[PDB]
Write an enzyme that holds these catalytic residues in place. Structure first.
Site, PDB file in Angstrom:
ATOM      1  N   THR A   1      33.907 -13.626  -7.583  1.00  0.00           N
ATOM      2  CA  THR A   1      34.360 -14.442  -8.694  1.00  0.00           C
ATOM      3  C   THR A   1      35.364 -15.456  -8.147  1.00  0.00           C
ATOM      4  O   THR A   1      36.057 -15.171  -7.182  1.00  0.00           O
ATOM      5  CB  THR A   1      34.975 -13.568  -9.800  1.00  0.00           C
ATOM      6  OG1 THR A   1      34.084 -12.486 -10.089  1.00  0.00           O
ATOM      7  CG2 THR A   1      35.148 -14.352 -11.081  1.00  0.00           C
ATOM      8  N   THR A   2      35.409 -16.654  -8.726  1.00  0.00           N
ATOM      9  CA  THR A   2      36.378 -17.675  -8.347  1.00  0.00           C
ATOM     10  C   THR A   2      36.762 -18.433  -9.604  1.00  0.00           C
ATOM     11  O   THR A   2      35.886 -18.846 -10.363  1.00  0.00           O
ATOM     12  CB  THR A   2      35.804 -18.621  -7.299  1.00  0.00           C
ATOM     13  OG1 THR A   2      35.445 -17.872  -6.137  1.00  0.00           O
ATOM     14  CG2 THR A   2      36.809 -19.647  -6.908  1.00  0.00           C
TER      15      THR A   2
ATOM     16  N   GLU B   1      32.862 -20.785 -10.878  1.00  0.00           N
ATOM     17  CA  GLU B   1      31.494 -20.647 -10.420  1.00  0.00           C
ATOM     18  C   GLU B   1      30.727 -19.785 -11.430  1.00  0.00           C
ATOM     19  O   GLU B   1      31.208 -19.528 -12.532  1.00  0.00           O
ATOM     20  CB  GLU B   1      31.509 -20.094  -8.999  1.00  0.00           C
ATOM     21  CG  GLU B   1      32.413 -18.904  -8.869  1.00  0.00           C
ATOM     22  CD  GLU B   1      31.703 -17.618  -9.133  1.00  0.00           C
ATOM     23  OE1 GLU B   1      30.504 -17.528  -8.833  1.00  0.00           O
ATOM     24  OE2 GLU B   1      32.321 -16.711  -9.702  1.00  0.00           O
TER      25      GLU B   1
ATOM     26  N   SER C   1      37.715 -13.019  -6.429  1.00  0.00           N
ATOM     27  CA  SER C   1      37.689 -12.592  -5.038  1.00  0.00           C
ATOM     28  C   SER C   1      37.792 -13.775  -4.091  1.00  0.00           C
ATOM     29  O   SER C   1      38.282 -13.624  -2.969  1.00  0.00           O
ATOM     30  CB  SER C   1      36.424 -11.795  -4.752  1.00  0.00           C
ATOM     31  OG  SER C   1      35.280 -12.617  -4.846  1.00  0.00           O
ATOM     32  N   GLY C   2      37.344 -14.947  -4.516  1.00  0.00           N
ATOM     33  CA  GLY C   2      37.501 -16.170  -3.762  1.00  0.00           C
ATOM     34  C   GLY C   2      38.803 -16.887  -4.001  1.00  0.00           C
ATOM     35  O   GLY C   2      38.932 -18.054  -3.630  1.00  0.00           O
TER      36      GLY C   2
END
EC number: 3.4.25.1
Lengths: 203, 221, 221, 221, 221, 221, 203, 203, 203
Positions: I1-2, I17, I129-130
């Site tokens: 996820t970002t 995203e 996570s990004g």
């Protein structure tokens, strides 16, 4: 388990295999994992069997009571949102399933719902243990311009390719085609055997 | 709700007095099928006729027509729907309509004992297809069930029942039974009143529940 | 709340007597849209006119106008708002306004059986846009729902309804329907009384709920 | 608490009769600010004047003046304080005073339905500064809210309101509004009675709540 | 406990009629201190005088004298003790006596709304030392609190209050205030009755609560 | 149980009327000890005299004699026993008898407020030895406690109390106090009635509770 | 923690140190662990701090309410029995403390109460982590014929000897002497510093 | 986290840094950990963030409702006792924080409260992970005879010395000075930057 | 996820995203993680999907009911405080998400809320996570003087740089710009594809 949902223009094609397995042991060679929930709506179960059958009975009751109280069928996003709210209210004593909901509400829709209630719409989805083989076929051969018969032949190729390489998948393929004109149509065994035998497959 | 020295319950009698002011309704068993006919006296031109439903569906096999107070009727129809779906979840199908009627009537009986609540002022007619075939029921505000073959509820009950114990015969077809029910409903009205289009619903054994559309009813007039 | 020997509920009749002392309100269906008109008789110059809301929003698609006791009206509007948001959480959207009206009216019916509580002295008019299009409803202190095309509640109900069964026609535009509703509201008043600026709210199919501002209403007078 | 055949609630009318025996109180909106004025008729020389508070603070931005039965008034002020602190814990600040008044008035409405409890014999005036600026409210023992610009509650309500619909103008300064409120409070009294020092409290937009001390009030007499 | 058409609560008035038959009691504020004086009419020679306590301690800083029905008085003193110890556990000390009086009086108010319970027939006088210094309170069976400087409760209230608005001056010493309270208590009695030894209790600022022994009271007679 | 306009509780007065029909009982404090004397009018020869206990033990240090309705007396003695054992479990010993009497009397007071229950028609006399020595108490159906030195309850109360305010002196020995109590109990009876053997129980400081046997009572006659 | 209770004829001497420590880290160099519960009664806490402070507030409320309702102070066996019933009703969600209760009720008493509610009376007791060093001094130097001043000097020697060899003990010594004549007397800091400096101790 | 409370005569100086960190990762370079609870009272939070913010909202409500109901501000020992009773009632489903409460109630007070409800008053306290470096500075440079400006310079030196050697501490220093005359005064950023730049520090 | 939130003067730019992944397996290539909660307010979800969707439905209901009952939109600090109180009331049966709330209430605000209810306002935030790759771009290229179009190009560069180095991030970028003049504006796919293709990126 192997479970496919395909969205085409004015059509939803959903299909499964039929094998029920106990850890390596084929307990039942003819299960039923593709259900009609509403007149233009079908869901498809994967995972544990008793939880999934309870979910099928509950959603048949909820959608029929909705249709009687409101004079018009439930939209598909509301079916998937209802399963999302239901599956997420437990979350810690969970239903260990994964579900597909497909239907027509002036647009064909396929929703994929997991064991914690995350409903995501996609143009094609697949649940079960034979899921990645189906995704392998559908990454290379799916096109949004296909007719209904090319769609049915595609899902038969995808589930056959999953049956060759997954040991928990097998049996007769159940295909159901959902359109606005004809409704939920469970395709007969003879036509599916004709398409399997015609495409060069031994199942 | 206590006993009278005659051995009577007065709130149940007064509830039946509230039932005698509702719209007249018929239920008729014909050859493998059941009819429900309800009068649709829409007085004002301002009432939307697209959503006046006098014949309520409880199930796509089971329907009911109510008379009396319309709010208590809506409550009892909602309880009948929830009870029908509980029987479908628990067992898988609805094998007998009589136990649905017994659950509704055992809801209606319970308010004729407890002192903190008044009885329902509603009489209902249930109708549908189960494994015993076509079945028709009548439910009385005391919670009293009677299985019938032709019946009426509402204001003009006695004229319709008095018509149907001299004009009713057993195994009519559908169109003859509808025509008999329509002339029964005309026999309930006094002169000066013409029937505006009533509501007629039918079911046959094997099929689902078919509600008549508008121009078919006007042809059946 | 028990039955009378005539078959009547006296607390419901007296609740309707409490409804007959409220402000007069209209609801009118026009060509793909609904109107709600309410009278705004602010007597004192000391009442703040910035926050007198007679037309309450339950949803940005669904509004209601109340009459009767204003405190019970505020309670029923708050219950209607919470019920609407429960339907949006559970399902995702509000597909039918009729079941919101049935939840409010099944709240209002429940106090006409139980002995430890009096009925609501409020009649409501619901209005909005759903998948069946423009819909208009009326709710009676017994818990009685009637779907309409033009209606009034309050003190001058009979003058407005008697005006709207001789002056109302089906598919008016918005401005003609507002002008008809304003002259209906003038037809309710006796002479000596001039309308100070009433409150008018409208919705069309596809758009959200539009409440008229001040100078547009004074132009529509 | 049930309905009268006229459509009236008698316990609410008798509760208003209990309200008409309280001390007279004013609330006046001036140019970016609100006033609350209360009469302080201390009869005996033995009552401690250091702790007679007629103007109760609910918040350092929000105050209220009560009339009627003083014990029910103390209960409603304590409920208003606890509700204000619940809104500050849940949200972080108090954005609208109107919903505090709606929570108090929905507490007061609830005792006008249930049979095991009598209504509150208290009318309140709320006042303060929120994001909509200076706001003034009045709450009626039926649970009825009216937003005002100048108001009175208590025994001499009609003399003060009758003074303030001929002597009140909109954007007064603070001292002119206090002087107008004091001569309003003198207009409520009959001759023979002179005002002993009343209690005056004020708030302006941006500042906190300022209660006048003693010699400033005696200068304002 | 419902409203009278005059706007009165009859059970509270009758409870005050039950209060008017108790023993006469005084509370007097003197220069940094509070007095409580109670009459000790022991009629029989068989009553043990070692344990007749008319002045109850709630705290070693806070005491109260009761009048009315003695059993309800014992219940309210026990509730006041438990509430005082809850404030000491939660906060660490008792900063204000007024909120102890508000908790007792909000216990007493609650029985003047609910229908399944009668009001308390007890009037109380609270007295003690907190951070605001010497404080004296009076609590009325409606739940009504008044902070005072000298007061009486019981049968001979009006003679003592009528004595103390002509004979009381502000900053007396302890012995002069006790002598004034004793001649007030003699002014309540009619002729033929001589005071047998009453009970006197005092507190000064900084010290704890001192109850007078026997021979000091007989010297103060 | 509500207030009378005189300020009276009628169910408590009628409960005292039920108390005035019980057996006469005495309690007398003597030199380091307490007596309880009860009349034992066994009318029929068929009543077993081996198990008629008029003086009930609550503790081997604490006893009580009851009058009024005997079933409510049995209930209050059982509650007193369970409360005494709760004080022994929680603390280790029973330091004060007065709080046992306050728990019983706060059980008896609670039924003189709540509407769904009648008061107890029982007056009790408690007696025993604690750290303050010999203590004697009387409990009134309103829940009213009075510590005494000699008392009576029952039908012939006024003759015994009228005997014991002219014949009782403070520090009698045991035998003189028993003889005085027996001639008090004879002074309650009218002529024609001779005392059949009453029940006498005594306790001295340090010892346990001693109940007299039969021939000692007949010698004490 | 270090906590001493000494019973002498007509006297109870209770004393502590003042250090509050977080696993090796001296968080507070002046705590308060010796409390007056009633006019002739003092308790002394050891163990976890928040539980012990809640127990102190509760026992002050219970003993004051007892004294008001009953006109005479609670006996010491009833104080210790009340703490025993209180601490034992949880027993599984426990208060992790250990307590001393000392007082005069026509006899001097010292009760030692553990975390599960076992109250045992003894002529001298000591709780805390520096407990065995105190018990080492009191096994060899305690005598029941001592005066009050020899008792105070003994408890100062015992807590000083515990402060030398325990790292969780330290700070100023708080001594309180309970007699029938004078009551609960918290000895001043100057007298305790005079007795520490006089006996040849550097603290 | 780094958190300092200093009691001087007629003054309480409380201060923090501003860094919010996720296990090594500086999530937020400007937090808020120094709050005004009452007119003469400020608390300062350390530990988990959501629990501490809930405690701040609750204590603002409790102290304001106390002030309205009682016409005089809550004493500081009652604030710390209220947090002690609140934090100790859970104790097993705990709030994992540690708090400082400082204020003026005719005497300056600083109370240190842990996660189980043990409130201890001390003349200077410090919570957080950078706590021992602050305690290292305050053991050697604190004096009770300091003025307010020497106190502010001392707390700036202590938090700077904690920021040099702790990785979970950093950012701008928030200093608040509580006096009876001026009240709770949050010192501006410009004065703190002037004192940091003046004392020879780069932050 | 970002997930990115950027505060500019008079503007809030939020973007994501669209990839939904099951432990390494791209289940859905088009999710929806950027939602409009109110007229001037948008939140953005990360973490578990079903919990986050339940939070979105609940916050849409709470903010719309607030707006109807109070005639003015909820302030952003009250939205974040409402999510903080909601997420912290469970805390042990937790919602395992992390959220951004951005909006205009006469000042642009971005609040970052974790799984236990710690809401912290910052000028730019990023969850998922990004997240550290986005923080790497925004540490070096963010400036508070940027226009709205430079802001949109910056967030496209940040999410593209996170998509290159995180395997759980990918798909089409959804950007929404919140201003007082225009409101919540979901930027179209064609403009975002034009900015991606224009800046020299292949996505």
């Amino acid at each position: 388990t192997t479970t496919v949902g395909i969205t085409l223009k004015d059509a939803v094609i959903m299909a499964t295999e039929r094998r029920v397995t106990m850890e390596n042991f084929i307990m039942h060679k003819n299960g039923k994992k593709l259900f009609q929930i509403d007149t233009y709506t079908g869901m498809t179960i994967a995972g544990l069997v008793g939880d999934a059958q309870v979910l099928v009975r509950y959603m048949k009751a909820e959608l029929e009571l909705y249709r009687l109280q409101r004079r018009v069928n439930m939209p598909i996003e509301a079916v998937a949102t209802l399963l999302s709210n239901m599956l997420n209210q437990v979350k810690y004593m969970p239903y260990m399933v994964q579900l597909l909901v497909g239907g027509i509400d002036t647009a064909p829709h396929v929703f994929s719902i997991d064991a914690a209630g995350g409903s995501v719409e996609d143009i094609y989805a697949s649940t079960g243990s034979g899921s990645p083989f189906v995704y392998g076929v559908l990454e290379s051969q799916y096109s949004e311009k296909m007719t209904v018969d090319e769609g049915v032949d595609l899902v038969i190729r995808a589930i056959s390719a999953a049956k060759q390489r997954d040991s928990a998948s097998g049996g007769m393929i159940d295909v159901a085609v959902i359109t606005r004109k004809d409704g939920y149509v469970q395709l007969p065994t003879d036509q599916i055997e004709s398409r399997i035998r015609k495409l060069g497959l031994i199942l | 709700t206590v006993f009278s020295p005659d051995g009577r319950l007065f709130q149940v009698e007064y509830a039946r007095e509230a039932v005698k002011k509702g719209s007249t309704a018929l239920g008729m068993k014909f050859a493998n099928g059941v009819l429900l006919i309800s009068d649709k006296k829409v007085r004002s031109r301002l009432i939307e006729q697209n959503s006046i439903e006098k014949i309520q569906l409880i199930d796509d096999y089971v329907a009911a027509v109510t008379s009396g107070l319309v709010a208590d009727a809506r409550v009892l129809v909602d309880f009948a729907r929830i009870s029908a779906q509980q029987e479908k979840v628990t067992y898988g199908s609805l094998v007998n309509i009589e136990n649905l009627v017994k659950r509704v009537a055992d809801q209606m009986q319970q308010y004729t004992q407890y002192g903190g609540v008044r009885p329902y002022g509603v009489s209902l007619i249930f109708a549908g297809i189960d494994q015993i075939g076509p079945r028709l029921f009548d439910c009385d505000p005391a919670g009293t069930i009677n299985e019938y073959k032709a019946t009426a509820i509402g204001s003009g009950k006695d004229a319709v029942v008095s018509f149907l114990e001299r004009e009713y015969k057993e195994n009519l077809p559908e169109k003859e039974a509808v025509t008999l029910g329509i002339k029964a409903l005309k026999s309930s009205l006094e002169e000066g009143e013409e029937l505006k289009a009533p509501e007629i619903a039918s079911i046959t054994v094997g099929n689902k529940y078919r509600i008549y559309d508008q121009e078919e009813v006007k042809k059946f007039l």
